[PDB]
Amino acid sequence: STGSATTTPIDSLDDAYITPVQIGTPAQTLNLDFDTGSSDLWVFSSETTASEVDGQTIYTPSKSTTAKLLSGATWSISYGDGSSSSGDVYTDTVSVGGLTVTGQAVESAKKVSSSFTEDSTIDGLLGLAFSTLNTVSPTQQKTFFDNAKASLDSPVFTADLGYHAPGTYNFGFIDTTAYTGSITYTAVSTKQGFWEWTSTGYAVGSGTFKSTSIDGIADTGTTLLYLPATVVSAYWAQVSGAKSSSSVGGYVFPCSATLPSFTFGVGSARIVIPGDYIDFGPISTGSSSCFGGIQSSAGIGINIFGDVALKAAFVVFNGATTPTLGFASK
């Protein structure tokens, strides 16, 4: 089997992407944030504290003839950005882009933190990291991909995120029309539960390529590109007036600037992030200070190849017995 679904930016800055997902019988369609950095499929629901729902579409398990309470199961998750959610668990039928999993764990939120409430466009998350990170207790549950894998034509999914435009998540096949040149594959460590890999280096604008190993994670659920302070300083040094602002929480730059591109290495291959992908707009409405899309990972404890990086590529998440990652230009 295969599936193919369009993923759409939630706003004009590409802060996140939402993909429609069918849950239950009859289908209830919710727009979920596909997150290769986590491993829980959780939704706003009829069980979510009323004051914490503000415009989201909810899953109502009592209206699904295929929903079953997973007795005794609870979940609770905290994300890198400080947000969190928790609740109980149902199993139900879940379909993405025509690909159907029966008996998928659907984690129903009883509580969500303010950032979730305040984002009316995201109805929940669909985790696509390794199932070892799933938070369900006392019986850990499998991700949608893990459940689908054996049925797929090939044990893969691909992320093709757009810049200020829709893109695609495919399951079970590689669309050879969706990229240019070849796909370069690179090794993955699953030791921390992530799609963790090692970039071979970087360049800033038309500058020379610096060969250096950068371990990090391919994370569709993180907006920005978080890299070591040395790398980030080298980038922003090429933008007149750019500076790190403790009050704002990262590098800012004059909105009048033209940003240089940023290149990262995948083996001997190179992925070029255009300068415009690195512009996240005014820090506050009407400001002429703009927020940068490349930020330091210092104090995160890990480098993160988030949407800023991934949207410059066609990305293969290869879930074969030994997983790997593939990157192509597009």
From Swiss-Prot:
Catalytic activity, EC: 3.4.23.22
Entry keyword annotation includes 4Fe-4S: no
Disulfide bonds: C255-C290
EC supergroup of this enzyme: hydrolase
Domain of life, per lineage: Eukaryota
GO molecular function, one term: aspartic-type endopeptidase activity
Disulfide bond among keywords: yes
Protein keywords: Aspartyl protease, Disulfide bond, Hydrolase, Protease, Signal, Zymogen
Substrates-to-products reaction catalysed: Hydrolysis of proteins with specificity similar to that of pepsin A, prefers hydrophobic residues at P1 and P1', but does not cleave 14-Ala-|-Leu-15 in the B chain of insulin or Z-Glu-Tyr. Clots milk
Residues covered by the Peptidase A1 domain: 17-328
Active site: D35, S199
One of the GO BP terms on file: proteolysis
Family: Belongs to the peptidase A1 family.
UniProt-recorded name of the protein: Endothiapepsin
Source organism of this protein record: Cryphonectria parasitica (Chestnut blight fungus)
Range of the intact protein held here: 90 to 419 of 419
